[PDB]
Amino acid sequence: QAESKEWYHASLTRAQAEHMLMRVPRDGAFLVRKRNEPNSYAISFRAEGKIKHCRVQQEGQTVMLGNSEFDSLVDLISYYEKHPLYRKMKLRYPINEEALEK
């Protein structure tokens, strides 16, 4: 049920993600960005009133994050909308230029 179009950025740096997330001061706000290392993404998110980043590693057709693994990035995000990602924080508010304009 997570929708990549609402949170995914193919081309966005860490600094740009931070500038976006500063504008929506809600824990659980997040976006996902491709990194310029192969088979790598970052989830940039707010938790504990701060902006943090975690890496997601692709291996073959699956993506890995800590003790967890999924058939797609969309499925990983779906899972962490239902289960906590960082301490008690779940992914809650997908952030994009569209969201921010509103």
Binding site: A42, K52, H53, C54, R55, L65, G66, S68, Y80, H83, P84, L85, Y86, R87
Partner: peptide, 8 residues
């Protein structure tokens, strides 16, 4: 952690 944190 460093520049990136570990997920649960």
């Amino acid at each position: 952690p460093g520049f990136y944190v570990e997920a649960n």
